PDB file of C-alpha atoms in Angstrom:
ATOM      1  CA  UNK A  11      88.189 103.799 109.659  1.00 29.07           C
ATOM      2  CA  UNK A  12      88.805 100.910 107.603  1.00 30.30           C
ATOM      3  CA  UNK A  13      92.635 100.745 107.618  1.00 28.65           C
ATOM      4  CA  UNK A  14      94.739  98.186 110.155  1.00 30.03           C
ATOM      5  CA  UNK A  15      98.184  99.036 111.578  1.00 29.37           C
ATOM      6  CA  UNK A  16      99.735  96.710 108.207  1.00 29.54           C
ATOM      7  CA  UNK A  17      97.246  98.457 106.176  1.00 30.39           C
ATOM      8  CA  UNK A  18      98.881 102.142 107.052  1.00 32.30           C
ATOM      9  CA  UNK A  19     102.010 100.730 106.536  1.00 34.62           C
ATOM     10  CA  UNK A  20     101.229  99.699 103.189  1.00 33.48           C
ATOM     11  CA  UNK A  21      99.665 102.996 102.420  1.00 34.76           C
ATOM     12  CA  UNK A  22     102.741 105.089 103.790  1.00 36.99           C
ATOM     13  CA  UNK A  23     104.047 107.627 100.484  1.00 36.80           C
ATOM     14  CA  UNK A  24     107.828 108.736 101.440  1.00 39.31           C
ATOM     15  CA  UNK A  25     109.017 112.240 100.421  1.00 39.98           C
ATOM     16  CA  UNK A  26     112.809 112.361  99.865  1.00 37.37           C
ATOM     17  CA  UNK A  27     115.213 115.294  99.060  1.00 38.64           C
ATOM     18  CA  UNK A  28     118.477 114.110  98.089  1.00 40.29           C
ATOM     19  CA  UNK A  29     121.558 115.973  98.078  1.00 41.57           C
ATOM     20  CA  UNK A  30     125.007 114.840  97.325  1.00 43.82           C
ATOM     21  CA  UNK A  31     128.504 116.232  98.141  1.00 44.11           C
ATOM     22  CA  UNK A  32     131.972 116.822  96.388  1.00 45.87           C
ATOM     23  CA  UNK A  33     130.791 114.739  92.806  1.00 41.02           C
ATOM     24  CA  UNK A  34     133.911 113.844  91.274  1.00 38.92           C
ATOM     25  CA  UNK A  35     135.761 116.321  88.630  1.00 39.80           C
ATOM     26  CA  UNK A  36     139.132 115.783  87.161  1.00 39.19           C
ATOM     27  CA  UNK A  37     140.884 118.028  84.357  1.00 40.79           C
ATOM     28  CA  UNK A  38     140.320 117.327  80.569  1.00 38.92           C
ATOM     29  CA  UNK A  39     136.431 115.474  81.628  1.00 39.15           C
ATOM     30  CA  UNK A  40     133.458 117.596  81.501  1.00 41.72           C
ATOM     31  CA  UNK A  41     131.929 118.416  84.362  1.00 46.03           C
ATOM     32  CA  UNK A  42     128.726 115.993  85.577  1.00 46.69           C
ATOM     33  CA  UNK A  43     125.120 116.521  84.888  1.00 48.90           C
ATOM     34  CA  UNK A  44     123.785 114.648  87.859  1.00 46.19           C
ATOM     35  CA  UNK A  45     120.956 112.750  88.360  1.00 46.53           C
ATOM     36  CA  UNK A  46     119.417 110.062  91.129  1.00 43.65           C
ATOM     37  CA  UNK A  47     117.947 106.847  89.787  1.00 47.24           C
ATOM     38  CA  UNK A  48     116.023 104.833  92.974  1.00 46.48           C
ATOM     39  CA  UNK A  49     115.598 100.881  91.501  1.00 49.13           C
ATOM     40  CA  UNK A  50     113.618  97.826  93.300  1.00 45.64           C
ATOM     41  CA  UNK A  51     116.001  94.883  93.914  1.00 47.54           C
ATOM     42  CA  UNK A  52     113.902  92.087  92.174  1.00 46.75           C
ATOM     43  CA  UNK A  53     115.079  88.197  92.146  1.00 49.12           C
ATOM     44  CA  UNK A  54     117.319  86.622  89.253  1.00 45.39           C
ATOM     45  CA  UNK A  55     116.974  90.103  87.659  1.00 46.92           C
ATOM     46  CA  UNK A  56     118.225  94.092  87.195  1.00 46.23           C
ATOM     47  CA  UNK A  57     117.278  96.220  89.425  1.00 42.66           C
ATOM     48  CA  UNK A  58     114.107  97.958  88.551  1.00 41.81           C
ATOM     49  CA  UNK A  59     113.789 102.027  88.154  1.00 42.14           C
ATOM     50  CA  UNK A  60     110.920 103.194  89.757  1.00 42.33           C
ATOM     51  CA  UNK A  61     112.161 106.750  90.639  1.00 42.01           C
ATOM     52  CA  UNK A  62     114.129 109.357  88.939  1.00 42.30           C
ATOM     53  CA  UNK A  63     115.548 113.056  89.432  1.00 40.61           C
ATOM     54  CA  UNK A  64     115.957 115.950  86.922  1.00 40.67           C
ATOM     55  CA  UNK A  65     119.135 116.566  85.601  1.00 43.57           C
ATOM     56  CA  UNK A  66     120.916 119.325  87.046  1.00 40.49           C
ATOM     57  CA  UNK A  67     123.708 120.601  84.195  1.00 40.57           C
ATOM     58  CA  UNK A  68     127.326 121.322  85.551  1.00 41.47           C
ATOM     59  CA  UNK A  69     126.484 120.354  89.502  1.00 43.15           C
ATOM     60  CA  UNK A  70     129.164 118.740  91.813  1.00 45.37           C
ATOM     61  CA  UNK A  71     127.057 119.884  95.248  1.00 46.05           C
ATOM     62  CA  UNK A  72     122.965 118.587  93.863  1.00 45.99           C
ATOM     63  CA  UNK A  73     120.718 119.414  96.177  1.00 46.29           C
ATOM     64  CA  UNK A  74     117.048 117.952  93.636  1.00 42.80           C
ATOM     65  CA  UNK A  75     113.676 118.638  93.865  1.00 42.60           C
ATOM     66  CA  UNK A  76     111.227 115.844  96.316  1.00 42.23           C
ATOM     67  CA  UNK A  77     111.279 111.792  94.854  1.00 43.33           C
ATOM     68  CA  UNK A  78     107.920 110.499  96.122  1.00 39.87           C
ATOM     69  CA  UNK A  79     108.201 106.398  97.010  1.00 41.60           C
ATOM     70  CA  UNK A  80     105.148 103.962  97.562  1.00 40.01           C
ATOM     71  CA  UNK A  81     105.530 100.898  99.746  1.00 38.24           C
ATOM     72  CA  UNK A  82     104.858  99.443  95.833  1.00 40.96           C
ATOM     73  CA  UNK A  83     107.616 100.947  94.597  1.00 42.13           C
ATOM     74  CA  UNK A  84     110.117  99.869  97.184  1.00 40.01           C
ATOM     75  CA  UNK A  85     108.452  96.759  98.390  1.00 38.98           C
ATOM     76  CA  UNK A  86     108.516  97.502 102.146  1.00 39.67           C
ATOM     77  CA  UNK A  87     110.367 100.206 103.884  1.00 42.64           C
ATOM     78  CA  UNK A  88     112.884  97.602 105.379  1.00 39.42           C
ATOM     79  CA  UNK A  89     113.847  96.617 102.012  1.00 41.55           C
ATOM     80  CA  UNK A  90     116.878  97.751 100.361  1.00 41.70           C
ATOM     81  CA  UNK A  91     116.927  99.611  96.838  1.00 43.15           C
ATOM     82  CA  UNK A  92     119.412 101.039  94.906  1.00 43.45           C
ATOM     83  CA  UNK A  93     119.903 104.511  94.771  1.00 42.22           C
ATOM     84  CA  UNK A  94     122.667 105.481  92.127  1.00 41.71           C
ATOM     85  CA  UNK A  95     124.243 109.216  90.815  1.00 44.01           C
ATOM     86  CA  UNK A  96     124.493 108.875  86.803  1.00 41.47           C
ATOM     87  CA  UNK A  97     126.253 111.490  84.413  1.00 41.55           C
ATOM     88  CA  UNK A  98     123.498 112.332  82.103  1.00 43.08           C
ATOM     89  CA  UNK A  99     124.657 112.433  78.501  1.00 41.19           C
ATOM     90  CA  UNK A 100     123.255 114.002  75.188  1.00 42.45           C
ATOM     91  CA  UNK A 101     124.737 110.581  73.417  1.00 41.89           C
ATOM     92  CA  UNK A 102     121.793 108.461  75.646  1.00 39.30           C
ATOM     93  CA  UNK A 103     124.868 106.382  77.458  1.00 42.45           C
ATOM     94  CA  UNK A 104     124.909 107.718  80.608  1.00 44.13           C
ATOM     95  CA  UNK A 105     127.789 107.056  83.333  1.00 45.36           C
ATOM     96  CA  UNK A 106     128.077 106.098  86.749  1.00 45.48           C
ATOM     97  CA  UNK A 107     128.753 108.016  89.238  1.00 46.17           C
ATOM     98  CA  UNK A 108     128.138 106.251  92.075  1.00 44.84           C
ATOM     99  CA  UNK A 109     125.946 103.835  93.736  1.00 40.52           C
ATOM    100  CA  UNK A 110     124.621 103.033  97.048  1.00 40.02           C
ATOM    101  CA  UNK A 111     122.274 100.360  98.693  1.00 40.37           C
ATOM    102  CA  UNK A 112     120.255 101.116 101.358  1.00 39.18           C
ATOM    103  CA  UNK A 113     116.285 100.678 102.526  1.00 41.47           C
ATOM    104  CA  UNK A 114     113.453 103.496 102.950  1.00 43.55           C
ATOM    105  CA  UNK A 115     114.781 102.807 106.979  1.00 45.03           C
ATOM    106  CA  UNK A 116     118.237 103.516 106.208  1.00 44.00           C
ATOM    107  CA  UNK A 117     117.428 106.662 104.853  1.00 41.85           C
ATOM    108  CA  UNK A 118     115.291 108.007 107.503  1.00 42.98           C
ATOM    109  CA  UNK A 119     118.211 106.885 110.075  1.00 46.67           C
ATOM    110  CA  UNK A 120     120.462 109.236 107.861  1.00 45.85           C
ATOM    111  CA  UNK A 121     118.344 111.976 107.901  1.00 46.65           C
ATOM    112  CA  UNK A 122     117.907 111.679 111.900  1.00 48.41           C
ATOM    113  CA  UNK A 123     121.187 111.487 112.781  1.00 49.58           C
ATOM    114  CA  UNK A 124     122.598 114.459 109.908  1.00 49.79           C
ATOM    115  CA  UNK A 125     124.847 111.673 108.697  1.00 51.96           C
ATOM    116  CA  UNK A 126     126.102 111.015 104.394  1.00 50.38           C
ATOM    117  CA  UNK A 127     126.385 107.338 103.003  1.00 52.52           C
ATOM    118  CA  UNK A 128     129.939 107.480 100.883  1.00 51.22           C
ATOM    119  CA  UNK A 129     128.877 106.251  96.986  1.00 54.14           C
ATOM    120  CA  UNK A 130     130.999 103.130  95.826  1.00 53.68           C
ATOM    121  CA  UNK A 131     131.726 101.986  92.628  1.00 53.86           C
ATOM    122  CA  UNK A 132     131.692  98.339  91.601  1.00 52.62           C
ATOM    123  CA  UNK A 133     134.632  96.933  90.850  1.00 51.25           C
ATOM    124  CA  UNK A 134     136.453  93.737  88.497  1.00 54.13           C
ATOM    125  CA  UNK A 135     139.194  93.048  91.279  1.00 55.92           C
ATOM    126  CA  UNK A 136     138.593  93.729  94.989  1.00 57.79           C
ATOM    127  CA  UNK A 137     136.022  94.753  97.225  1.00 54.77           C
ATOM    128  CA  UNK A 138     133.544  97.955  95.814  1.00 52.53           C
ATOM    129  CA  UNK A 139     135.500 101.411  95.678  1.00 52.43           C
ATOM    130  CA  UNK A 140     134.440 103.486  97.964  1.00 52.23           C
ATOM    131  CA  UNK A 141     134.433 107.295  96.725  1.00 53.40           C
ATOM    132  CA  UNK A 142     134.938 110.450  98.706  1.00 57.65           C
ATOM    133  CA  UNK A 143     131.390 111.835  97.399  1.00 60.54           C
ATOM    134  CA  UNK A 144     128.842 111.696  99.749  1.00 60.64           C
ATOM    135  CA  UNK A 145     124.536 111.025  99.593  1.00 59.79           C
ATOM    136  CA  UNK A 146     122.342 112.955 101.949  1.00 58.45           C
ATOM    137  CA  UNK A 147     118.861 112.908 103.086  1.00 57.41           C
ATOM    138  CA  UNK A 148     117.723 116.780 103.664  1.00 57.30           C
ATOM    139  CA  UNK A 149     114.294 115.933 104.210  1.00 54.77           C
ATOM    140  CA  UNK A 150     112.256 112.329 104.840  1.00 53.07           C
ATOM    141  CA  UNK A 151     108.463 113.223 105.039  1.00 53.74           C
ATOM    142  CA  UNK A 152     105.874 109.988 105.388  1.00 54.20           C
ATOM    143  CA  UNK A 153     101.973 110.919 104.591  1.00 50.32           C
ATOM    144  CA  UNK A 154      99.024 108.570 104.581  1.00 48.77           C
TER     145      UNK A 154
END
């Protein structure tokens, strides 16, 4: 063929299923409607979106249907992204949830191992909060 070892790299498409654990809830608040946003870190800048989930109404346990990620969308599979959990309102403004940072890499090692990343929140005082609900990686498929 025509394709180098960098070349098949480049061409690698990632299939992801997310799940998360134990969303937040608290009395008197509405229960979440989750979704996953999955942004490209870009310099001096916001992160980019380049993948998104459907909202699932009323769902503290989301187990969504497969993301698919290019090595475009991500920039390499060593890079990191952001991968955040967003309260999807009728109003347009919706809220965070949580928030994680981790590369195409990262994820797979989650997978592998059976292992959750805790979400954080960002914080005005002090380090990042770091939240009880959990991010998994049910399934981490790479095709050509």
């Amino acid at each position: 063929g025509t394709s180098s070892m960098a070349d098949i790299g480049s061409k690698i498409s990632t299939e992801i299923v997310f799940r998360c654990s134990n969303l937040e809830s608290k009395d008197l608040f509405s229960k979440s409607d989750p979704f996953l946003v999955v942004s490209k870190i870009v310099e001096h800048g916001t992160p980019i979106p380049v993948s998104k989930t459907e909202v699932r109404k009323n769902d503290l346990n989301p187990i969504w249907k497969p993301v698919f990620l290019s090595v475009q969308q991500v920039g390499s599979k060593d890079s990191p992204v952001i991968i955040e959990c967003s309260d999807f309102n009728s109003n347009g403004k919706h809220s965070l949830i949580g928030k994680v940072q981790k590369s195409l890499s990262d994820l797979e090692k989650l997978h592998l191992a059976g292992q959750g990343i805790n979400f954080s929140l960002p914080t005005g005082a002090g380090q990042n909060k770091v939240l009880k609900s959990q991010l998994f990686v049910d399934k981490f498929t790479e095709t050509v």
